[PDB]
Amino acid sequence: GCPPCESCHSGESTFWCYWEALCPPC
Numbered sequence: 001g002c003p004p005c006e007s008c009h010s011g012e013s014t015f016w017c018y019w020e021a022l023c024p025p026c
Contacts, residue, residue: 005026008017017023
């Protein structure tokens with residue numbers, strides 16, 4: 001499950017966005 005698109009891709013503190021990174025934008 002991809003968390004809110006406000007994070008990840010140079011957004012907020014990246015927890016798994018540098019690792020899994022499978023979080024498409026809204």
